[model samples]
Target: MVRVGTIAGPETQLMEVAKQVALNRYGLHVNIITFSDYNTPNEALADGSVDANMFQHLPYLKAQIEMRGYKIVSIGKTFVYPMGLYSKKITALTQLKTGAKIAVPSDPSNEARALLLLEKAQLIQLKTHINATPMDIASNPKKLKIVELDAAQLSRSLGDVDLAAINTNYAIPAGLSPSRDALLTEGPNSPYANVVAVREDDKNDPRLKQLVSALHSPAVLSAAKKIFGDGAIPA
Candidate 1:
């Protein structure tokens, strides 16, 4: 059996490809290890609780590396979930009112993404200093009131704020289709690549390689398009 770890279940259309790839390409039964919160998957991976994990992007993973001192490394790229700005108050980017209330993610990876998307939309400007991470909302031309909310809670609080930048997994699970519901989104080159993470020591293991290879296999890609539409489907 191939053991894999991640946040959410098969319902999280992106990461679920690992399980499908194992079963179809390697003919291995998958032992899925689930996580609820963001931090613990990497923690479990570091402590050797699971063989590998298939949640998180480079930004947050890199943050974990800097903060927690883990040796986890990327085994392979899985899929991209284009982060989006969804607003109950405004439909078009030009429609945003001055002093708009915008909700942001409290977490690092997505918060950075939110800021970048806003910059692209011309809703705000960020300082050129310190490489401008997500928490780097240094300039607000709209005089927008920013509210920081937990990533998972952003969707439910949609009615509470004028707008919120939401991660795709949280957006999908909240019953918003990535293809249909998002207002404005990051494009094809979005840096939000979700990858299978393994300890660097295990990088070349045959089992791990098989798991990574299978993510791009026919069965996996076909299933991805069927379930997640073209967006979460891989290249």
Candidate 2:
């Protein structure tokens, strides 16, 4: 059996669809393992606990590879859960007051993504685009205070911060849908498309190719639409 690791929630749900596709079409048995946090899947994969994982985007994998020196590689694209700006205190972006607090993911790639989203809304400008931090803000029109928090914690911080740029993975678990609750959302063509990852040694495995093909199948597409609606764009 080919073992795969995935974060809990919609990611795990989608993998279940892929698992069936792998079994029926390719005769590949997929054993899925669930993870509660982002850091562990890659760790599990590196330590030989899982054959592959399906929850993170390319940029996140890049950050993990660079920072921790994990020899992981992306084999295929999955979908993009367009990061969105959520707020409990304001109905619209225009309602955001000066000095309003904003919460973003603490991880490098997602922090840059959140900052880029804010920049897209014309709230701030960044000196650099890729893997940007709050210090990279070239200009802040509203003097908004950007705070970095754990990606999982961003949704929970909504009550304390005026705005929070949340990944759909975490947002959905918190009962926030990008289409229904976001004040502003990244477009479907976002660069942060999620990917299937494996250790460098497993990059050429044929079963992995089958798994990726299964993920891109029509059935998986329908499953994504049912689970995330427009929140997740097929990559």
What TM-score goes with each of the models? Answer: 0.90, 0.97
Per-residue C-alpha lDDT of model 1 across residues 1-235, encoded as one tens digit per residue: 6677877844345446656667766787767788887878888988888888888888889988988999989977878877778876777777777887888787766777787887887888887741245346667877888887888789898888888888777777777766787777888687778888898899988888787787778777777777667558463
State the lDDT of candidate 2 residue by residue for 58-98, as single tens digits: 88999988988999999999998888999999999999899
Ten-residue region with minimum lDDT total, candidate 1: 129-138
CA shift of 229, model 2, Å: 0.3
In terms of TM-score, which candidate is strongest? 2
Q: Which ten residues in a row have the lowest lDDT in candidate 2?
A: 127-136
Clashing pairs counted in every model: 1, 0
Query: Model 1: how far is 52 from its true place, Å?
Result: 0.3
